[PDB]
Design a binder for this molecule. Structure first.
Ligand code: HEC
Length: 391
C-alpha cells in the first residue's frame, strides 16, 4: 500500500504543503478571535476554514501584503461595485478621476471645516457630562464630513444618518416604529443616489463630485448612470463606519488608560503617531480575494476565497514587536490599516484628518473623562454597540 505519502514519488522531495486541518471558523468574528484561531491553527502563513463555502485565511504581514499587491493572482471580482470590484487599467482610470477629490492637500483644505464641525458638536453636549460617543457625536460628525467631500446637501444628513443606522442595526430585533429597516435601507440609499444624480443633472454645481462625473470618460466612453450610481453608493457605504469605529475604539482606550490619555492631552506633537498606532491596533476589516490559479499564496486552489485580515497583518510580531501593546512611540509602524496595492483606501488621508481633528477638539473641551462602569473590561467596539463616556 502507500508509504511516505509525504514524499513526491520518483524524486522523493518532501511536500511543502501548509500543515493543518480545516477548522469550522466563522469569518464574522472579532479581531481577537482571528488572532487566537491563527495562533492555534495557522500553518506556513495560513489556516483554512471549512465553514460554509469554505475559505483560506492568510495570517502573516508579508503574505497578506503580497496578496494585496498581486491582483492577477488574488482577484477582486465577486456583482459590480465601483471601484472595489474593478481591476487593471480600468480601475486605475477610476482612481485617476477620483484622486483630486481625496488628496492629502484636499484633506488639509477641509480640515478647518472638519474642526468647526467637531467643535460645534462637542460644545453642544459638554454641559451634559455624558454622551453616547458614536450615536450622538462620531457618526453624524463623520457623515457630515463625508457629505461635504462628496457633495451631498447637508439638509439630508438626518435622512442619510437614519439609513446608515438601519444598516448597522440590521441584525437586531426589528423595531416596527422605524421608517428604515434591514430590508429597506439599501433600496432607500439607491433611491437617494438616483435622486441626487437627477438633481445635479438638472442643475450642475461647480466643485461637486457628481456634477463632475457627467464629463468623465472611462474606457474611452462616458461614464454610465449605472456606474455613477454604483460609485456614489460605494462612497456612502465605505465612508462612515470604519472611521466612526476607529474613533470610538481609540477614545474608549484613552477613557480607560489614564497614562495614555495624559500623554495625548499634554503632548500635541505625538497625536499623529498616536492616531497611526490606534489605526494599527483597532484594525478589523478582512478584505476578500478570489484565487485565480492553483497554488495562490502557496496554499489556495483556483476559485478559492482568500481573506486578508488586517487584524492579523497589523499584529504580526515579526513586524510589530509586542503587537498587543498600544505604544504611541512605536518605532516601526508600517501598518496596513488602509490596505495596500491598487485598492488601498481612497479616503485614508480624509479619515486620518477626521480622527485626529475630532480627538484634538475633544481634549480641548473634555480633557478628562472616563467610562461609567469601570468594573467591566471594555470590549472591542464593532457592529451594534453603545459607547457611553462621562465627565
Ligand atoms: C472618503 C471615503 C472613505 C473613507 C472616509 C474611508 N474609506 Fe476606505 N475606501 C474607500 C473607497 C472608495 C475604497 C475602495 C478603493 C478601491 O477599491 O480602489 C476603500 C477601500 C478601503 C480598503 C481596501 C479594501 C480592499 O478590498 O482592498 C481598506 C482596508 C479601507 N478602505 C479601510 C478604511 C479605514 C480603516 C477607514 C477609516 C479609518 C476608511 N477606509 C475610511 C473610501 C473611504
Amino acid at each position: 500500500g502507500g508509504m511516505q505519502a509525504d514524499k513526491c514519488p520518483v524524486t522523493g522531495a518532501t511536500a511543502t504543503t501548509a500543515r493543518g486541518d480545516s477548522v469550522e471558523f466563522d469569518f464574522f468574528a472579532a479581531p481577537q478571535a482571528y488572532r487566537r484561531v491563527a495562533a492555534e491553527h495557522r500553518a506556513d502563513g495560513a489556516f483554512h476554514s471549512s465553514r460554509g463555502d469554505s475559505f483560506w485565511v492568510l495570517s502573516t504581514y508579508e503574505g497578506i501584503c503580497a496578496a494585496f499587491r498581486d491582483e492577477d493572482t488574488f482577484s477582486v471580482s465577486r456583482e459590480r461595485w465601483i471601484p472595489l470590484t474593478i481591476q487593471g487599467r480600468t480601475h486605475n482610470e477610476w482612481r485617476r478621476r477620483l484622486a483630486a477629490w481625496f488628496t492629502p492637500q484636499r484633506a488639509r483644505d477641509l480640515t478647518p471645516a472638519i474642526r468647526a464641525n467637531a467643535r460645534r458638536r462637542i460644545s453642544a453636549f459638554v454641559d451634559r457630562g455624558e454622551v453616547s460617543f458614536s450615536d450622538e457625536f462620531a457618526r453624524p460628525y463623520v457623515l457630515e464630513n463625508l457629505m461635504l467631500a462628496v457633495g451631498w446637501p447637508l439638509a439630508d444628513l438626518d435622512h442619510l444618518l437614519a439609513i446608515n443606522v438601519a444598516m448597522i442595526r440590521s441584525r437586531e430585533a426589528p423595531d416596527p416604529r422605524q421608517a428604515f429597516n434591514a430590508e429597506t435601507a439599501f433600496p432607500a440609499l439607491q433611491e437617494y443616489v438616483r435622486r441626487h444624480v437627477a438633481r445635479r443633472r438638472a442643475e450642475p454645481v461647480e466643485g461637486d463630485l457628481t456634477s463632475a462625473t457627467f464629463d468623465w470618460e472611462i474606457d474611452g466612453t462616458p461614464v454610465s448612470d449605472a456606474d455613477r450610481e454604483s460609485l456614489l453608493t460605494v462612497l456612502f457605504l465605505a465612508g462612515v463606519d470604519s472611521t466612526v469605529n476607529h474613533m470610538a475604539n481609540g477614545i474608549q482606550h484613552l477613557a480607560h488608560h489614564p497614562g495614555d490619555r495624559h500623554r495625548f492631552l499634554r503632548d500635541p506633537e505625538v497625536r499623529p503617531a498616536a492616531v497611526e498606532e490606534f489605526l494599527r491596533v483597532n484594525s478589523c476589516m478582512y478584505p476578500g480575494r478570489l484565487a485565480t490559479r492553483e497554488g495562490a499564496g502557496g496554499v489556495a486552489s483556483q476559485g478559492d476565497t482568500v481573506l486578508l485580515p488586517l487584524a492579523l497583518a497589523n499584529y504580526d510580531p515579526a513586524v510589530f514587536p509586542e503587537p498587543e501593546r498600544v505604544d504611541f512611540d512605536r518605532e516601526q509602524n508600517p501598518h496596513i490599516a488602509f490596505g495596500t496595492g491598487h485598492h488601498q483606501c481612497l479616503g485614508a488621508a480624509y479619515a486620518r484628518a477626521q480622527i485626529l481633528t475630532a480627538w484634538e477638539e475633544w481634549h480641548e473641551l473634555i480633557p478628562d473623562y472616563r467610562l461609567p462602569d469601570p468594573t467591566v473590561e471594555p470590549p472591542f467596539l464593532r457592529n451594534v454597540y453603545d459607547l457611553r463616556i462621562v465627565w
